[PDB]
Amino acid sequence: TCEVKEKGRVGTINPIFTCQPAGAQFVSIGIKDCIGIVHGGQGCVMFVRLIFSQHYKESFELASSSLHEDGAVFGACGRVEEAVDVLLSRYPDVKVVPIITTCSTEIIGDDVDGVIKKLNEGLLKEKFPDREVHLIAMHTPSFVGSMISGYDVAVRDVVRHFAKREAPNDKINLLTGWVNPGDVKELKHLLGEMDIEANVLFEIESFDSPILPDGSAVSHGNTTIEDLIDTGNARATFALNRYEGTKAAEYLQKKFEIPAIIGPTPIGIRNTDIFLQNLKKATGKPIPQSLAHERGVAIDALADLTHMFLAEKRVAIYGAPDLVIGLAEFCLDLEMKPVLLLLGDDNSKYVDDPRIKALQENVDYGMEIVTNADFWELENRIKNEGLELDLILGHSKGRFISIDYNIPMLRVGFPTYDRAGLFRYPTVGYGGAIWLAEQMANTLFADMEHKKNKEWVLNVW
Amino acid sequence: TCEVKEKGRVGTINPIFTCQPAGAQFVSIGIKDCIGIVHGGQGCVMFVRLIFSQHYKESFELASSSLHEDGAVFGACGRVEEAVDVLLSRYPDVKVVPIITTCSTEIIGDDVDGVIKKLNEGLLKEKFPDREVHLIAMHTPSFVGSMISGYDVAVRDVVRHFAKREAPNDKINLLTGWVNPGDVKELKHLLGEMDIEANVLFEIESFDSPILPDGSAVSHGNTTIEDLIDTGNARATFALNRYEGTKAAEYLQKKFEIPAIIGPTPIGIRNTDIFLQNLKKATGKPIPQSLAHERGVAIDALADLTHMFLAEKRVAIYGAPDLVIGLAEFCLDLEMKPVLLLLGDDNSKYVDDPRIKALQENVDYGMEIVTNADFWELENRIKNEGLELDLILGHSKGRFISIDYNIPMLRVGFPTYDRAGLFRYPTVGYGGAIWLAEQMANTLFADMEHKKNKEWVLNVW
Amino acid sequence: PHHEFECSKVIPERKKHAVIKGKGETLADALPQGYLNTIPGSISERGCAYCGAKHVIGTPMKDVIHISHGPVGCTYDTWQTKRYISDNDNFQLKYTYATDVKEKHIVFGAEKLLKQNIIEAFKAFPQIKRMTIYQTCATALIGDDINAIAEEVMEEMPEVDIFVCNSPGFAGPSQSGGHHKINIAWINQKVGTVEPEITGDHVINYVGEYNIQGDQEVMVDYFKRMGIQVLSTFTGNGSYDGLRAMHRAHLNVLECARSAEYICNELRVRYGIPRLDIDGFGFKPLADSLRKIGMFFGIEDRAKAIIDEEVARWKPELDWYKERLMGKKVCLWPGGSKLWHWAHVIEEEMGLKVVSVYTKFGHQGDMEKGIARCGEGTLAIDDPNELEGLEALEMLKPDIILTGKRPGEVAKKVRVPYLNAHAYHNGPYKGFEGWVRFARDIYNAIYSPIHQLSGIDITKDNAPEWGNGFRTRQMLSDGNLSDAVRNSETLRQYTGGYDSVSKLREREYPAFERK
Ligand code: CLF
Ligand code: CLF
Numbered sequence A, B: 001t002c003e004v005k006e007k008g009r010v011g012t013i014n015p016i017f018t019c020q021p022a023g024a025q026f027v028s029i030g031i032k033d034c035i036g037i038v039h040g041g042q043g044c045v046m047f048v049r050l051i052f053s054q055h056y057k058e059s060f061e062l063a064s065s066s067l068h069e070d071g072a073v074f075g076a077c078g079r080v081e082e083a084v085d086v087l088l089s090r091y092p093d094v095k096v097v098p099i100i101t102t103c104s105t106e107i108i109g110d111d112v113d114g115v116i117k118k119l120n121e122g123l124l125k126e127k128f129p130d131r132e133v134h135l136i137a138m139h140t141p142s143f144v145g146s147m148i149s150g151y152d153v154a155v156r157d158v159v160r161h162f163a164k165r166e167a168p169n170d171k172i173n174l175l176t177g178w179v180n181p182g183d184v185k186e187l188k189h190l191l192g193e194m195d196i197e198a199n200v201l202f203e204i205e206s207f208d209s210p211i212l213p214d215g216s217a218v219s220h221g222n223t224t225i226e227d228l229i230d231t232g233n234a235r236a237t238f239a240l241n242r243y244e245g246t247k248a249a250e251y252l253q254k255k256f257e258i259p260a261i262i263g264p265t266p267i268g269i270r271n272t273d274i275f276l277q278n279l280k281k282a283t284g285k286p287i288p289q290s291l292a293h294e295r296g297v298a299i300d301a302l303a304d305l306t307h308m309f310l311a312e313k314r315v316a317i318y319g320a321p322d323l324v325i326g327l328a329e330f331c332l333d334l335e336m337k338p339v340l341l342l343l344g345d346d347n348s349k350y351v352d353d354p355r356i357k358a359l360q361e362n363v364d365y366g367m368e369i370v371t372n373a374d375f376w377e378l379e380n381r382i383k384n385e386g387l388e389l390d391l392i393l394g395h396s397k398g399r400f401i402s403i404d405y406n407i408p409m410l411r412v413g414f415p416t417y418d419r420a421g422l423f424r425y426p427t428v429g430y431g432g433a434i435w436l437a438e439q440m441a442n443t444l445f446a447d448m449e450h451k452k453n454k455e456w457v458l459n460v461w
Numbered sequence C: 001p002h003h004e005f006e007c008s009k010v011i012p013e014r015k016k017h018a019v020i021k022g023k024g025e026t027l028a029d030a031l032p033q034g035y036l037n038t039i040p041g042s043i044s045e046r047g048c049a050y051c052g053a054k055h056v057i058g059t060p061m062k063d064v065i066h067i068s069h070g071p072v073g074c075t076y077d078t079w080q081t082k083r084y085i086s087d088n089d090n091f092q093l094k095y096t097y098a099t100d101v102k103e104k105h106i107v108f109g110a111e112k113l114l115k116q117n118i119i120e121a122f123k124a125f126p127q128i129k130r131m132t133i134y135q136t137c138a139t140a141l142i143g144d145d146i147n148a149i150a151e152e153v154m155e156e157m158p159e160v161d162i163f164v165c166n167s168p169g170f171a172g173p174s175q176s177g178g179h180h181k182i183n184i185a186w187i188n189q190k191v192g193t194v195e196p197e198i199t200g201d202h203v204i205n206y207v208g209e210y211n212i213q214g215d216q217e218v219m220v221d222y223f224k225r226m227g228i229q230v231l232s233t234f235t236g237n238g239s240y241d242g243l244r245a246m247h248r249a250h251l252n253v254l255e256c257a258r259s260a261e262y263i264c265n266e267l268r269v270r271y272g273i274p275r276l277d278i279d280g281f282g283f284k285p286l287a288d289s290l291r292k293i294g295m296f297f298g299i300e301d302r303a304k305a306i307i308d309e310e311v312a313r314w315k316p317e318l319d320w321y322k323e324r325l326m327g328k329k330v331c332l333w334p335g336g337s338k339l340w341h342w343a344h345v346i347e348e349e350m351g352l353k354v355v356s357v358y359t360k361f362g363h364q365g366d367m368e369k370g371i372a373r374c375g376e377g378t379l380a381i382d383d384p385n386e387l388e389g390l391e392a393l394e395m396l397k398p399d400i401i402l403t404g405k406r407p408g409e410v411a412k413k414v415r416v417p418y419l420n421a422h423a424y425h426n427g428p429y430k431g432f433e434g435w436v437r438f439a440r441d442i443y444n445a446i447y448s449p450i451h452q453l454s455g456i457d458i459t460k461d462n463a464p465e466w467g468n469g470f471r472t473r474q475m476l477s478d479g480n481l482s483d484a485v486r487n488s489e490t491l492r493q494y495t496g497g498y499d500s501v502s503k504l505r506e507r508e509y510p511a512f513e514r515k
């Protein structure tokens, strides 16, 4: 049966995620003309910019308040004030400036809402009166939740800041979740075929930036102030990822009565079907033949693989909880046996997830879902408790388990730095169902050749 | 230096290609309402339908004339006559019917042009007067050339039969060459961006066919009779693959004065640049900024890999000669060292390929190009003459060399049956440049992990 | 009675090749035609006689350079399309040879070319001292004397032995003529030419077994657990020189009668070796087969020990599948022998209803066995073409077919799942364990949640309102099971690992005491 249990150890060995501020920084890099300031020590931002570099091989703009010894003793609201001044004074185009707290500035208790109000009435009116500048508090203490909850918080804070319901319209708010450019592309394709306009939070396709002959391009997000304000006017909010867009979706529900459709994460055929059904329901638009065709093209790809190769494969999955769960679900439709799911933070709401209730009702073999997990929860099981696996699905930080215990691994989630180009491919939708199934197969195939495990069978499947 | 030399052995050990009829059959399956009849023994068609099944996991419709002993002694035109009747009588929608010769029927000297004359004036007028039916002889003896030259022959036979110049237009003829659906999609993207209309020989995207809820779909080509007639009306013929499109392009140049632009195969950034420049020249259409942006996006991906990982990698390449040569050129732009190219048939014109003369002029490391090659030309060099390789690029029939000599291999060309979904991705254009370079990297990366060869370095590239 | 297809009304000769087993009908009432010429343009499933000789029977021999005398196409087209494995590191899969006959050889012949090829091949493969040369359409027609050239090389090189198979594609209507040709060439040219070392009181030839995914290794496991010397396997995992000593066997154990009855029949006439026909598939047919071989050698207790152990190990897993498969419809659509090997036992032991069987190249003898073994109502077809297969799918509406790869991909489009009857899915399928693997693959194909998904039209306003983002195979299969079955403490899903054969290769066998 499928047993949900909390990690036993109190400590962390080999972490799956980083802290809430990293999630707020990720939200912020997805907004046009946005540069967050991370209020804390320099590493809290510089290390996170490296994370994003590791995934994308691009540099994104984020600043530090540069906390030092004095501010840690006496308070550091002045460090923020100077930061805002220095940032605005040197970056003329910036219009959005999140103020993102860290463990330090939360503990020492700096009044961020206070110092923002001061700058709005003060500095911004005096020195910068001709400029649009939105300062936004993001309270993201590192000693609760994770980058995942930080993301949820930040999306709420940006929508809370900007959303107004002046001119109701028929658009939806699509909160993609923390996904790849290839996911944004896929989701936009689905919306286009449904003929449904949306505010897409976030438009990060432009993270894949060119080298132009005139050296003029840069990676940036394209979610605009206008789009964020327009979130108040939508007829519904589709928050695909419950752990990354519940707060913003419910905020708009509670504040403007915009209905929130939370999940399921559209991973796999069946979950993509539910998305399209939910769009129809919300908007009244019919599901067109063209998507039934693309769906069937996807199913064809899956048919070639499922009972021949994927059936009964033993899978471990980790990463963002919505990804983990979505993948587990799709794997079961692919006849596979996900046997260990790691959910690598303290969220108390996993046990209440309907998708996890369904797994508990319906799974009929030995499965574990470990909450507050770390990578030692997987490695210890392999090394000392005889867990047998055919495949891992997760991000690159788990890689040494794959490498050193000879279990092949498909790179999914964030960050994926030990493979090239993965951000351009979908994991959601019908296109993503194709990509996941074919790449799991291709991963298994390479492994069968490595180990000489019936490698000769790959001829007339 | 780069030396072109002919295989020493007279015999074949582990063949790279099959025979001419296979190529004619491939041309045939890309035409709407086409079912070719392969005139010879039953294996000449059934085995080839299996090759196509191996690549696409789809069934295509091709028939046999079912040569038995009688025909081998007395001649077998009667079998063709009966095959045409039985086919048309049971397939009411067929409109194009190639008659594809084999070793047997060439040897026994059956007059296929004559038997087509007879059916046109006889059976087709008497039994099928209200139907359009095009019978097209394709002379494809298996004891010369290969499936590559057979493809070349067939494209000419089909264009010769249909092309008329009764309504000149500003379209081009795009002869893709023997490519994947992903390449068709890519090339049509470029044309769309260039604002150029084309007759695309061949429209094989519909090879990737759905399972629909009513079970109504089938894999098929979409190059129509109308398209093939209109090849006579074009302002230019783009034959990307010299060894697969020269005959057809030159036929139209001589018959209808349509200028023929033969190659280069658009693999890599530079070859794609040349294609777009050649299209500008021949149509007067300018190269838009959109394609410059897309180009720079592809260059960015390459920039992340080239000097860190691809540089000086020793590569061997086999498959269709145009693919082999295009890949070698791109590899050199990626700072790699292709040290062995296999060209696996008797074509006497390789030594005159200008792309090959450029390689001879400009390479000064040790590099061999082997003509009339087979796979033992590769295996023998590894096994018994100390050839060191970092990487192989080739189709799935070479796989056991990769597997048994522990050299990693990117699957390119035809057929690629030991991996899933490869036909949906491009090898040509800027999209193809990305795909090739990132998949070569990912191949190298998995190999580094398998061998524990500085696998720890894949963190902050 | 005979059956006509809508799609073949225009070619009424086809009506003779199909029968529905009618109420109270016997084999004397109706039987399809078989082993006739093919109808041109029909899109018949058939291959050539080179296929039958070289691709099916010849190439499995594990210690042999398999060289096709002809243009490269015949060779390319038969390379890396088969799953006959061997314990000679799959030499027979990894290495293939073609003479690469060109235009200049059409006028003047290709005898020198043939010879140069043979020398080149022995040079490149110094560990291999055996060779079979297969004739193709082109070399038959140009008239090279292959036998002479082989003799010529055997004179010059007394360390090598070369076999000649003159079975070009056009030599007959199908695979079948190739079967006959290579059987008779082998016994004429080669049997009797090697005296074997005998290592046991009980010696068999295992005949008509090609070791698809390890089938032969499964069966030879059982034989060795009985202290039987397997002198020869014709030809799966077989040794060229082993097969030259077939004349010394005590018993010919024949599985694939279609492909290898010819050589068993001549081995009886020439050497008085008796022919015993067996089934390699299913618990009862296999138990019976092994019991008989045991009795024959007076070692029936050893057979019974294997049978009891194997059935105890695996029956609780076979029966898990049987419960979920009961009443599901299946078409047994291989090329040959498998249709009658499976016809009865698959219904009995897996719960399937056989609604059709076909043979591409089989004789009337194969339809005798097939009709004899299936139930009334069953549609039996000789030399099917594509349209007929498609029409049978619409008319019979089977839950699964067992068929070739590309035929399976035709069925895929019309929402009929397949297993590869020929190459298997997760083979091997012979043996007690194999039978369970077989069942599991069928179960996984029928109850695939992707298959369930594919039948849903998402444009439809009253569509299934999905709840969870998954359905397990068990959620699709177990809904109407009795509680006794659902809660069984004995019935379980398959417990074997991905590769059921590699364990066999690392196994020691208890020796027995010779008289
Ligand atoms: S300057 Fe350096 S990296 Fe920063 S916190 Fe301080 S020691 Fe550490 Fe740590 S948990 Fe996260 S990353 Fe920060 S907000 Fe706190
Ligand atoms: S029925 Fe069979 S497979 Fe056909 S030729 Fe004849 S023996 Fe061979 Fe060979 S080289 Fe190609 S595939 Fe043919 S056209 Fe000739």
Ligand SMILES: [Mg+2]
Binding pocket: A056, A057, A058, A207, A208, A209, B300, B301
């Ligand atoms: Mg980049």
Ligand SMILES: [Mg+2]
Binding pocket: A300, A301, B056, B057, B058, B207, B208, B209
């Ligand atoms: Mg397909």
